[PDB]
Each structure stands twice: as C-alpha cells, then as structure tokens.
Ligand binder design. Structure first.
Ligand SMILES: [Cl-]
Ligand SMILES: [Cl-]
Ligand SMILES: [Mg+2]
Length: 219
C-alpha cells in the first residue's frame, strides 16, 4: 500500500536520483542490487556516523570484520540513557505482532560494530539512532524484509571471516522532516560474494506515519 504508493516512489527518486529501483520482497532493490562500495584490503575496521545540516542522523560508513564484531549482550556492554528518544519519537501500541509501533533504529547494528572502541554502540547514540518502525527494524521475513534481514546477511558474512564494507543512509523527503521515510543499506564483501543495495521503507502495515513529526495515525 504505502510502500508501493506513488507518493513513496517519488520521495525515493528525490533521494536516489536516476538510480533504477524495483519493489521486491517488501523492499526496494536499487541499482539492480549493486553498490559502488569498494571493499579494499587496506582499510581497517571502523565506524563513522554523521549528522546533516539539520542535526539529523545522516550517512553512516563502516568496514566490518571480527575485530569490531560484538558477540556480547547489550546489557553487558552498554549504558544507554533510558530517557533519551530519537527525533520524531511517538510510541503507540499497535494491533499487530510487534505490539508497538516504533523501535530505536540503529543505522549501524550493535552486533556488527559494537566492539569498536570509542564508538557509542547504545540505543541512545544520537548520531546512529533514528525513529524506525518495528517492522522495518525487526523483519527477518525473507518475503517481507526489514533491516534485520540484511544485517543478518552481513553478520553471517563476518562470522565466515569475510570483511564487509557497509553503508547505511537515512533518507529524508526534505530538510524539515524529523523521521526518515526509508533506510538505504549497501554492502559489499571483499570476495564479492555478498553485495546488496536496498531501501527499506520505514513503514508498518497497521498504520501510517507523518515523517515531518513522526506522529502515528493507526489504521
Ligand atoms: Cl575461524
Ligand atoms: Cl508490519
Ligand atoms: Mg535495528
């Protein structure tokens, strides 16, 4: 519905330009699932968050391997501000299996880079966390994919001792919006076996969200 809506595809185009895209398995494959990311042997593992000129979390880059892979539970390694809330955060109970509307959506996953020293890997890192639907955050449904599905592919590659160049960009309709309408994920392993370039719609079937405010209107 919203995902395939014309208003959505227009925003996507505004954000990615003349790049081809194709709605498949609940997400948009961009550039025929190919990214320009190059995984060079000579880049050390790292994570870098940015914010845009509107103080919103922007493009995140990383090189992922076993030296920054985080195998421990969050509660053992992080002390997040329990009170902190990302931009446009408006939580509501939902009539679906998630039971709630939005999650704290990490750009770069805790488990992938949480052992990079000096980088805040908690849910309260204000440069790495946005307001994200529970569906687009959590979904591992191969036929209705969320960001987790793609993070899992990356994690599995790392756990096979592959080095993965990784980029996560929140996409905004404009300068004003507090919340991204989609999450752009790109990855490429050194041996090239893993590669993708997708946009995960920041949506959930049970409702619609105003990306300007992050206010949720249930169905
Ligand atoms: Cl091994
Ligand atoms: Cl859903
Ligand atoms: Mg997540």
């Amino acid at each position: 519905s919203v995902d395939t809506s014309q208003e959505f595809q227009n925003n996507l185009k505004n954000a990615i330009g003349n790049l081809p895209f194709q709605y498949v398995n609940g997400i948009y494959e961009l550039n025929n699932n190919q990214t320009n990311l190059n995984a060079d042997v000579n880049v050390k593992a790292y994570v870098q968050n940015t914010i845009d000129n509107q103080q919103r979390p922007s493009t995140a880059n990383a090189m992922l391997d076993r030296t920054i892979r985080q195998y421990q539970n969050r509660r053992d390694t992080t002390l997040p501000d329990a009170n902190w809330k990302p931009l446009g955060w408006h939580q509501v109970a939902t009539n679906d299996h998630y039971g709630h509307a939005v999650d704290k959506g990490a750009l770069i996953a805790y488990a992938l880079a949480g052992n990079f020293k000096g980088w805040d890997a908690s849910v309260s890192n204000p440069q790495n966390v946005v307001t994200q639907t529970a569906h687009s955050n959590q979904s591992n449904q191969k036929i209705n994919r969320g960001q987790n599905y793609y993070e899992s592919l990356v994690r599995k590659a790392v756990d096979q001792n592959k080095r993965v160049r990784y980029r996560v960009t929140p996409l905004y309709r404009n300068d004003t919006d507090l919340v991204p309408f989609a999450m752009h994920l790109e990855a490429k392993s050194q041996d090239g076996t893993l590669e993708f370039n997708v946009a995960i719609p920041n949506t959930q079937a049970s409702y619609t969200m105003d990306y300007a405010t992050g206010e949720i209107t249930l169905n």
